[PDB]
């Protein structure tokens, strides 16, 4: 028997929406440790011989995120249901509801890890976004608010 | 005592956030009912027993009214 704030999970995002989430999210990959290194060696080669803009990539530490929700930096939040201590995230869907930040429980904790160069992630969030995908994001958000927030208004109740 | 403990906006929020997220423990689950039927008089009695001192229970029963009153109306 499950208390309502637990298994506010398991009522995750659907198939078509989920893929489209990653359709967006895989666009915002953090640079890999290999890539970052070569980039800088490319700089060193150049800057030893003879401008850049701030780079959008998704945000991924639980800390960093819980910072970001509640500070309004966050736009969309992705929260994996299966986590070793569930308690490590149980507050998180409510916090977001309270700061009005759009959130979706995604299925597959490893599946978050994909989009972020790590083994797992528990939580990732897309804070800032490119100009072209700005509309793509805000629509996804709405899609999520329909099929997840409005569909499961009774997720805060029922055991 | 100069750094006593001014409320802080963040911490206040968290306390209440957790207060609502967790729900209510069995003695408190009994306690809110003991307010709604038998009155604040009999409510404090069990609270004083269930915790240590009266001062603890008093501040506890006062937190109970804050929950019940803010829940039904707002």
């Amino acid at each position: 028997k499950v208390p309502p704030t637990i298994a506010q999970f398991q009522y995750t995002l659907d198939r078509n929406t989920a893929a489209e989430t990653f359709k967006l999210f895989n666009k915002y990959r953090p640079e890999t440790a290999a890539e970052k290194k070569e980039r800088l060696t490319k700089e060193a080669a150049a800057v030893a011989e003879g401008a850049s803009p701030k780079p959008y990539a998704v945000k991924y530490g639980l800390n960093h995120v819980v910072a970001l929700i509640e500070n309004k930096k966050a736009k969309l939040v992705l929260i994996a249901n299966d986590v070793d201590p569930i308690e490590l995230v149980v507050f998180l869907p409510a916090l977001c509801k309270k700061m009005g930040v759009p959130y979706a429980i995604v299925k597959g904790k490893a599946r978050l890890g994909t989009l972020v160069n790590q083994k797992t992630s528990a939580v990732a969030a897309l804070t800032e976004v490119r100009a072209e995908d700005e509309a793509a994001l805000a629509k996804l958000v709405s899609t999520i608010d329909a099929n997840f927030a409005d569909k499961y208004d009774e997720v805060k109740k029922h055991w | 005592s100069y750094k006593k403990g001014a409320a802080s906006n963040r911490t206040k929020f968290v306390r209440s956030l957790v207060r609502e997220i967790a729900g209510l423990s069995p003695y408190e689950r009994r306690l809110i009912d003991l307010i709604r039927n038998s009155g604040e008089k009999r409510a404090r009695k069990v609270a004083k027993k269930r915790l240590g001192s009266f001062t603890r229970a008093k501040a506890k029963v006062e937190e109970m009214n804050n929950i019940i009153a803010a829940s039904r109306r707002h």
């Binding site: 208390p3 009005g100 805060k156 | 707002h74």
Partner: peptide, 15 residues
Amino acid sequence: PYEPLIDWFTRHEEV
């Protein structure tokens, strides 16, 4: 034993 979690605090969004 199994009351619905009445969200007495998240009802009102923070500005």
